[PDB]
Design an enzyme around this catalytic site. Sequence first.
Site, PDB file in Angstrom:
ATOM      1  N   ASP B  50       0.881  -1.150   0.000  1.00  0.00           N
ATOM      2  CA  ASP B  50       0.000   0.000   0.000  1.00  0.00           C
ATOM      3  C   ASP B  50       0.929   1.213   0.000  1.00  0.00           C
ATOM      4  O   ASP B  50       2.144   1.045   0.150  1.00  0.00           O
ATOM      5  CB  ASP B  50      -0.825  -0.020   1.251  1.00  0.00           C
ATOM      6  CG  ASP B  50      -1.674   1.194   1.393  1.00  0.00           C
ATOM      7  OD1 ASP B  50      -2.507   1.470   0.486  1.00  0.00           O
ATOM      8  OD2 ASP B  50      -1.519   1.878   2.432  1.00  0.00           O
ATOM      9  N   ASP B  52      -0.183   5.050   1.073  1.00  0.00           N
ATOM     10  CA  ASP B  52      -0.465   5.980   2.135  1.00  0.00           C
ATOM     11  C   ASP B  52      -0.416   5.327   3.509  1.00  0.00           C
ATOM     12  O   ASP B  52      -0.968   4.259   3.722  1.00  0.00           O
ATOM     13  CB  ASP B  52      -1.778   6.664   1.860  1.00  0.00           C
ATOM     14  CG  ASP B  52      -1.616   7.828   0.899  1.00  0.00           C
ATOM     15  OD1 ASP B  52      -0.505   8.372   0.840  1.00  0.00           O
ATOM     16  OD2 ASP B  52      -2.593   8.227   0.213  1.00  0.00           O
TER      17      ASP B  52
HETATM   18 MG   LIG Z   1      -2.859   2.763   3.783  1.00  0.00          MG
END
Ligand SMILES: [Mg+2]
Lengths: 468, 468, 468, 468
Positions: B50, B52
Site C-alpha cells: 500500500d 499511504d
Molecule cells: Mg494505507
Amino acid sequence: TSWSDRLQNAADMPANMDKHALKKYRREAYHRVFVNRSLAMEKIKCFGFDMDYTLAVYKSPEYESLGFELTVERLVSIGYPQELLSFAYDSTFPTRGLVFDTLYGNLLKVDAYGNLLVCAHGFNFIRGPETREQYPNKFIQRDDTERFYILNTLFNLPETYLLACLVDFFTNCPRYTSCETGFKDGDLFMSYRSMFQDVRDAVDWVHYKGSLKEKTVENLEKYVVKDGKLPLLLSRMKEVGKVFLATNSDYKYTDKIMTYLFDFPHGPKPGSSHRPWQSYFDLILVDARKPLFFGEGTVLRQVDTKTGKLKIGTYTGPLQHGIVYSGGSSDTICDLLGAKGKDILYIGDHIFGDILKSKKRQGWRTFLVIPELAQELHVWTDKSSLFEELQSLDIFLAIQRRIKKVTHDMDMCYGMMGSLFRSGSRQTLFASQVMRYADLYAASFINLLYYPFSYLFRAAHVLMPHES
Amino acid sequence: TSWSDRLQNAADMPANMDKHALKKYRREAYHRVFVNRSLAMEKIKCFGFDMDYTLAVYKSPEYESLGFELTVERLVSIGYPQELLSFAYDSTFPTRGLVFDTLYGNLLKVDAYGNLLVCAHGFNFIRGPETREQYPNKFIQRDDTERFYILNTLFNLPETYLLACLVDFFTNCPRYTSCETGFKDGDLFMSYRSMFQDVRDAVDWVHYKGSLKEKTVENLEKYVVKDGKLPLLLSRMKEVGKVFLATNSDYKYTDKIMTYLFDFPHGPKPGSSHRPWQSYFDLILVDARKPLFFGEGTVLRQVDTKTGKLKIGTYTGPLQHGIVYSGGSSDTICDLLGAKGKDILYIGDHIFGDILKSKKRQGWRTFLVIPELAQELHVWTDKSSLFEELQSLDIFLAIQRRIKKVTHDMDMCYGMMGSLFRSGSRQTLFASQVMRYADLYAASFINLLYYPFSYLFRAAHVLMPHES
Amino acid sequence: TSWSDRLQNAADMPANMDKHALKKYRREAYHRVFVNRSLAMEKIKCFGFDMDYTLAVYKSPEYESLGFELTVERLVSIGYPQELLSFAYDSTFPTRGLVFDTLYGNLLKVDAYGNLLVCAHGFNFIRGPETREQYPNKFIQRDDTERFYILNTLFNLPETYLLACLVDFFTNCPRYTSCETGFKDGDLFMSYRSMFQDVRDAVDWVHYKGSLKEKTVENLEKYVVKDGKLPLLLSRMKEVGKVFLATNSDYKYTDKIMTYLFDFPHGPKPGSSHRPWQSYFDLILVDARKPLFFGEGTVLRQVDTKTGKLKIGTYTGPLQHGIVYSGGSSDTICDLLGAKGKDILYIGDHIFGDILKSKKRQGWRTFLVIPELAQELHVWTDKSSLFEELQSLDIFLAIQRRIKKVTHDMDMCYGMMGSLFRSGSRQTLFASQVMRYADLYAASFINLLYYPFSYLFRAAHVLMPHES
Amino acid sequence: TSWSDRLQNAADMPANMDKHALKKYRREAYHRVFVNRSLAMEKIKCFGFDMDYTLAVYKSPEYESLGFELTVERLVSIGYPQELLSFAYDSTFPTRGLVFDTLYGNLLKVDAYGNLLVCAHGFNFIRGPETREQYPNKFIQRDDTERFYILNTLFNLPETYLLACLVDFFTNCPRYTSCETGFKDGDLFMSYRSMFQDVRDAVDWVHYKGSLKEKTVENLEKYVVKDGKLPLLLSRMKEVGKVFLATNSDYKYTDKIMTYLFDFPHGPKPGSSHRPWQSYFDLILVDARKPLFFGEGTVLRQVDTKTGKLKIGTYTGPLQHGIVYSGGSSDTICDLLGAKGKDILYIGDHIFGDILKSKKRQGWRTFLVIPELAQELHVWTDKSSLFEELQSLDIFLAIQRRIKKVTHDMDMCYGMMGSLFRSGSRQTLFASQVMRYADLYAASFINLLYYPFSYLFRAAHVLMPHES
Ligand SMILES: [Mg+2]
Ligand SMILES: O=C1c2ccc(S(=O)(=O)O)cc2C(=O)c2ccc(S(=O)(=O)O)cc21
Ligand SMILES: O=C1c2ccc(S(=O)(=O)O)cc2C(=O)c2ccc(S(=O)(=O)O)cc21
Ligand SMILES: O=C1c2ccc(S(=O)(=O)O)cc2C(=O)c2ccc(S(=O)(=O)O)cc21
Ligand SMILES: O=C1c2ccc(S(=O)(=O)O)cc2C(=O)c2ccc(S(=O)(=O)O)cc21
Ligand SMILES: [Mg+2]
Ligand SMILES: [Mg+2]
Ligand SMILES: [Mg+2]
C-alpha cells in the site's frame, strides 16, 4: 463405545451432592466446564436453554441411522436410484463442521481462514498436490455461502455421510459419467450443487413432514438420553435465578420430549413429588426461529396448551403463570425476565444460531454444549504422547513426511475425518469459533452441577506478541 | 515527541548491513517484526505494498492538523458556525479505532465483542453507571453499520477529534438545546447522525476536491517521512522475488509522493546511480478501490503515464515493461505475477481493506504496518510495572476501585482515549483484529530489512482449554 | 343461471363447420373474439395454452364453494372460531380484480390509476365522504404491494368473499373490539394484515396439500366444463402450426384434467378414433412457474410419464416425440419450436402472469380468456339503455345525485361489487389491463373456431388528442 | 425556423385578455390545451411548477449546441481523441425519447410494447430484415434498464446526437476495429456500454461541475425564452388558489433563471409595479430530487436566501412568509398547502419524474409541457394529406412497399428520427405515456391563460371493444 454411551454412563449415576465429592468429580475432564472468557456465576440471573442436542441428547449412532435411513428413503421415493437403499450409516466417517463444496462435490475440513486441512471426494481422500488443481491456493472463500455449505450441527451428521455416499456411488456407477462439476446420464446432467439441494430438501422433509419425530417419540429410550440429574440442576438454577426455554422446536414435539426427560418416579431428587416439566421454567418459548430470534424475531404468539395449536393473533399481555410463547425475539425474553444480556447464560449446541449470534447480536453470556467432547476426550489422553510427539517434530524444524504421517495416525483415532477441533497440529474453523464465541463449554451442561453457585470461572488474560 | 518523530529518527540512520549488527538491531522492540501466525519468508514470491501510511508515512501532528484545519474550514464554508475556526487539533485526544455512535453522539472504545471500555460524549468521559442509561447492557451491536461508524485509519484521526469538538461545542453553546439524539436551534434540528454525515462529507471533500494533496505536495519534508533504507529494502525484495504496488491513490498523486520517497542523490545504497521509483516494481496498480479490489474489482485500465489520464477502454494486453494499471482486481495481480495467494505478502496499514479482506477473501499473507506502535512501545516499557501491578490486582481477586483507578493512570499515559490495543487489562476490537488477521506486524515495514531472506517467523501453536 | 352455465350451454352444441354458418355464429357477441391490437392469424405459427380456467374451466359456483368450504375448514382447523363453519359462499358478492387493503381491511375496486370506485368494509359499502377519512385523496398507491393485495384470478373468488366474511364477522362479534387496523380480543390483537395472511396461507394449503384436487378429480362432471369442440380446435391448430401447453400445474394433476377434457367416444370430430390428449401437442411443459417462466425460468427438467415423478437432473437433450417438460422458461419453448415471439399466440386467463408478462417480457402475442365475459355480456345488453342513460346524464353536464343513483342501479345488475370492467361510467384497473395487454380476448378461446385460419383481426388506429 | 422560435414568437405578443379574443386565440392549435382525462379547473386549488424546460424554456438549437460542445470538450479533456472537437450539433438528427441499446450501440425508437420502429447505428439506418440478426423478434425488453437507456428529456438531446456521432466516428476510424459490442484498438477494448457511461458522466459533469450554468446565465437572452405573459398567468393563478415551485435545480441557479423570467419593467401586466419572482409563490421548494420527491423524499431543509447556502439541520417549523425549502417531499407540499392530490395541478416537462410518478404515486393532476409540440404541429397540418394517405393505404389492405415508402417520406419531414409521437401509422412509447399519464398537455403551460378559470376540460369516455 461412542460418545452418547459416555453421556448415558454419566447420566446413570445419581449426583453425590456433598461439596468435597463435587470438587473431585469435576476434576476428571469429562465433567469439567471449560472456560474461554472469565464468567462469574454469582452474576448470572437467568439460565436459558436450547432443547435438541442440549437438554435432549439424541443417542448415537441410533438416531443418526434413523435420520439417514429416512433421508435415503425419501430420495429414492422421489426418483433417486434403488441402490441408495443398500447404503448404511457409518458413524466412523463424518466429523461435524465440514464444509461441502457444491461446485466440485468435495467434503472439506478447514481452518478459521478456510485453509484446506482434509479434502475428501466421495471416499477418496485427496492428497496435497492433487488438491491444487481445484483449489490452487489451498483455500476456500468461507463467505461464499452460495457455493459452500458447512454442516455444523449433529443433525447434519446423516447428511455429511450421505453426501459422501452419493458422490462415491455415482463416481463408480457405469451408468453415469463423471464431470468436473457433476454427472451426465445420457441427456440428464445432475450437478453436485443440485444434488446437494436434493439432499438438503430431503432432510428438511423428514424433519418437518416425514416420520422422524413420529418414529422418535415412540421409542424414546432408544433414541434419547435420560438423566436423573437434569431436574436437579434446573431446580437448583431456579433457586438462585430465572430459568427459560427458547427452542426452535414446536410445542407438541417440545412437549413429548421434555415430558420424557422429566419422566422419573420423583422430582428433582429421589423421594420428592414429581412435578411437570413446565414448572421448571419461568418463561417457555417455542418456535423460536433462531438465529432470526436474535434479531428482529417474529411476531410474538401465545400457545394454547390444550390443543397445541397457536391462539389467533399477536400476544400483547404480560408474563403470566402458565403461559407459553411462540416466536417473538430475544428482547421478549429480556424485557419479560427484566434482564439485560450479560445477566443471562444461554446454553445450547448450535455454534452459529445459539452461540455466535446471541453473543454477537445481544451480548448474552454463552455456554456451548459439545456432545462429541466426551469421546474426543478419551481419545485425546489415550493418544496424548502421539500428539506430544507431533509437537516435538514441529519444534525440531529449526523429515517433513514424518510430520504428515504422524498427523495421519493421530487423526485416524478420531474417525476418517479426524477430530472435531483439529487436524494434526492445526485447529479447525469449528475449534476457532468455540474459543471465540463460547464463553464456557462442556461435553454436556449437566457439568454445571459440579460447580458451586458462586464459582468464578477464570480464563487467562490474552497478550499480544509485542506485549510479551 | 510523538510517533512520527520516532520513525523519522529511525529513518535517519543508514542501515548497517553486517549480519551480526542486523540481528542485534531487531532485538530492540521498535525494530522487531511481530508474529501472529508463522510465516516462512523463503516462500514469499511477491511482496506487495500500500502507499499511504505504508510506504509514505505522514508526519504527526502536522499532517493531522492540516486535515483538521481543512475540514473545519470546509464545514464553516458550507454554513457551520464561525466558532469552529477557533478549534485547534489536539493530538493527545484521539486514539485510533474508536466507534462513533451516531444515535447519541458518543465516541466509544470497544472490545472485540463490542463491550464498552471507554465512552466519551464531547469531552465528558462518561463513567460506569451513567452509561447504562444509553447502553443498558454495556454493549453495542458492531454489525449495525447504519448506526455505528468506527474510525479505523490514521486518516480518521482528524475526524475523531473533530466529532468530539463539535459535540462539546454544541452541548455548551446556549444558542442550541441538547437532546438525546442531537441539538435544536429554533426550528432547525441537527441530529448527531446528520452532523456526523456532514463531517464525513467534508473530509472526503478535502481529500478528493479540496486542498489537502495540493498543500501536501508543496512541502513534502513538512508532511512526509523519508528514509534512505526504503529503496534498499525494495531492491532487496526484487532480488529474491516480485515486487508490486497496489494503491487506492490515483496515479498523479502516487507519482508525486513516490518520487519524493525515492528522491535521494543515489540508488538503493549510497554511491549507486539513482533509479526512478517505477523501476522498483514488477507491477504498478493504482485506483485499486480496496476492499472491492479483493472481490469483483473494477474494470482493468491502463494509465497513460505522460498525461496521467487513463487510456480509453479496457486493457486486455499482457504485463509489459513500463505499463501502469488502474483498477482491476487482486486476481489481476495473481494471474499476471503468476502467483497464488500464500505466495504473496501484502504490506499495508488498513486493518480492514488491506489486511482483513485480503486474508479472508484471497488467502494472501499479511503484514500490518502500525505507526503508533513506535510510541505505544515506549509507553509500554516506560510504564511496564504499572501494568504488572494491574495483572497483580486481578490475580489477588480470589479493592475493585483500585483496579479502575490503576487502569485509569495507565491509559492516561497513552492519551485521553488510551492505548490503541487495550484499555487496562482488556483488549480492544483493534487489538483483536490485529492478532486475528495480521500475520506479521510492526511499527513500519522497514523492520523487514533486519531479518534474513530465509528467516522463519514463528508463532506458538494455539491450544484449546480442554487440550491443556 | 351464472356464467359457467352459459359456457356449458355453448359447449353442448356440436360445431356447424360450414363456412357461412360460422360467420353468422360469431356475429352473436358471446362467440366473438374481441380485438385490442390487430393480429393476422396467417402469421401465428404456434398456439400455446394455459390449463386452469383456460382449457379447463371450473363450473361456478360449485367450484368456488368447494374452495371456500375447504379454506373455511382449514382455518377453523388451525384455531379460527367455529362460527366460520356456518358461512356459505355467495356468488353474488365478489367481482374479480378487487384489491384488498391489509391496513384497514377493506375490499377496494379501483381504476387504472388506483382511484377508488367502490370501497367495502366487511359488507358495509362505505359511501363517498366517509371514505375520505382513510383515503384522503380517494386513491391508493397501486405499487405498494406490501399493503395492497389484488385478487386477480378466478381462484381468488373464494378468498374475495372470505375476506369480506371474516371482516364482517369480527366487526360484529362482541368477543372482539374493532380498531382502525384490526381486532383486539383480551390480550390477542389480530391485524387485518395478519388475518389476510392466514387466509392466503390457507388457500395455498388447500391447493398444494389439502383436498381440493382430490375432491375435484373424483367428480369431474360436477366441477369441470367439457366441450366436444376443444379437440376439434386444437386439431385444427396443429394442422396449420405448432401447438403447446405450458402450465403451472404439475403433471399428475395436468394428466387427470386433460384426460377428462379429451374423454369423448371419438377424436376431434364425431366418428374418428379417439387419440390421447398428449397427441394434440408438439410441446408439453408443466411446473411452468409463470410469471418467472417469462424471465430466468427455472432449471429445465424431464417428466417420467409412467411415475409422474421428475427424472433426476437437468434435461439437456432435444425435443423428442413423447417427452414432457417441467419448469424451464419461455425461451425453451421459443428455441425448441423454432419460434420468435410475435410468431406465437399465448392463450390464458391470468391477466398478469399469462398476459401482461408474456407481452412485456417477450413480445408474445396474447389471447386473454375471460369466463365472466359470458354473463357480463347478457347483462350489458339486457340493461343497455340504462348505460346509454348514464352516457346521457354525463353529457347534459355542460342532478349529480341522479348520476350516482343510476350508476348504482347499473352496477347492481352485475353483483354487489359490480361489473368486472367498470363501475358506472368509469373503467376498472382490470378493464384497463385487458385493453393494454391482451391483443385478443373472448369469453372462451373456443371462439377461435369460428374465425378462418387466415382471418385478419383488426383494431382501429389510436390518435392522440392533438392529432384529431 | 425550429420550435423555440415558435415559442419566442408566441411569447412576444401581449395577451388580449378580452374573453371573446381568448376563445378564438385557443382555437389555433399551437395555443390549445389538449385533454387526455377530463379535468375541472374550478377544483384545482394549487398550481405547481417545474422550472427547467417548463417555466424556463431553453432556446433551440443554441442551448443544445452549448451542451454538446461542452460535453464534447469534457470527453476530449479526459482522453477521447481530438477528432471529436470537429463534431458540430445537428438539430435535425435526434428525436426525443429514443432508447440507447448499450449492448450493440444502436439508437432505437420504440412503441409502448418496445417494438422496433426505427433502429439507427451511428448514422446508418438499419432496415427491416437486417435488424433481425440483433433483435430477432423485432422487440426489446423495456424493463431491462441495465441494458437500455432511454433519453427522455430535452437535456438528453445533445447526448442523443453525441452517441450517434461517437458510434459513427469509431465505426469509420481505421485505428479501431468494429465488434458486435464495441471497438478494439490494439489492447484496449471499449464497449458501447462503457462508452455510453463516459458520455453520461460527461453530461452530468458539465451540468454539476462544468461551465453550462455559468455560460448560460451570462447570456440569458441567447439561451432562454422570456414571455411577458408568464407573470400574468401566475398572478392569475394566485388569485384563485395557491401557487408553488418544486424544482430539482438548486437555489442560486433557480434564482438567476427566475429573476430573468420576471425581468420586465412592470408587474403581471403593463403599467404595474414589478414585484420579485418569489412573491408569485405560496411555497418555493428547491433541490427537489424528483422522482424520489414523489416517494420517501429527502430530509426537509431551509434555504438561507442571503448566502444561498442551506441552513444547518432539519427544518421543523411551519410555512412562513419568505421561507424557501430544499428537498423534503411531495407530502411536504400537501401538508403545508393543506392539499390532497386531486386538488393540485402539477405542470412540468419530464414525462417520468414530473408526470408519471406524481400521477402514479400521489394521485396528483398533471399538465405536461411539450416544447416540440409547436413545430410538430406545423408539420402535422403542413403534411396532413400525406398522413391521410397513409390511413388510406392501411384501409385498402382488405403494395406493402408503398406503405413503408410513404411512412418514410412522412417521418422525414420531422427529422431523421421522425415525429416525437409516432413513426408512420404506429405510436411511440413517448406518445403512449403522454396519453396515459398526462391529464393535460400543451406546447407550453402559457396556453392555460386562454381558458377561463372555471373551464371544464373534457375527454371522451373510453369503451372496450366488447362494449361498442
Ligand atoms: Mg494505507
Ligand atoms: O447463514 C448461516 C451461516 C453462515 C455462516 C456460517 S459459518 O461460516 O460456519 O460461521 C454458519 C451459518 C449457520 O450455521 C446457519 C444456521 C442456520 C441458518 S438459518 O437458515 O437462518 O436458520 C443460517 C446459517
Ligand atoms: O464496510 C466497511 C467496514 C465494516 C466493518 C468494519 S469493522 O467492524 O471494524 O471490522 C470495518 C469496515 C471498514 O473499515 C471499511 C473501510 C472501507 C470501506 S469502503 O467504503 O468499501 O471502501 C468499507 C468498510
Ligand atoms: O407480483 C405480482 C403482481 C404485481 C402487480 C399486479 S397488478 O398491479 O394488478 O398489475 C399483479 C400481480 C400478480 O397478479 C402476480 C401474480 C403472481 C405472482 S407470483 O407469486 O410471482 O407467482 C406475482 C404477482
Ligand atoms: O428509473 C428511471 C426510469 C425508468 C423507466 C423509464 S421508461 O420506461 O421510459 O418509462 C424512465 C425512467 C426515467 O425517465 C428516469 C429519470 C430519472 C431517474 S433518477 O436517476 O432517479 O432521478 C430515474 C428514471
Ligand atoms: Mg440445539
Ligand atoms: Mg389460468
Ligand atoms: Mg423540467
